[PDB]
Amino acid sequence: HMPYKLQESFLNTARKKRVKVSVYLVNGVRLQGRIRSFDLFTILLEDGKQQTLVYKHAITTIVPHERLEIE
C-alpha cells in the first residue's frame, strides 16, 4: 500500500518514449516539444533545435500527444 511515484513515472515514460507533449503554463502559454530531461523542479523541453528549461511551478498541465502506458 505504498504511493506510486506518479509524476516521475509520467515524466520518465514520456521522456523514454520520446512522446511529444503540450505543456500549459499558469499564464495561458502552451509549449510543445519532447521532454529531454527533468529533475525535481524543472523540465527540459526540446523542439527540433530549441531548448527550453521550464519551471514546474509555472506549469498547470501536461498533455501527452500519445497515450502513455505509464511505467
Tell which one of 17, 18, 51, 71 touches a copy of itself (CB under 8 A).
Answer: 51
Residue 10 C-beta-side C-alpha neighbours within 13 Å: 12
Shortest Å, Cβ 20 to a copy of itself? 13
Q: Binders of a copy of itself among 20-49, rule CB under 8 A?
A: 25-29, 31, 37-42, 44, 49
59: phi then psi, degrees, rounded to nearest 5: -90, 140
Shortest Å, Cβ 39 to a copy of itself? 4
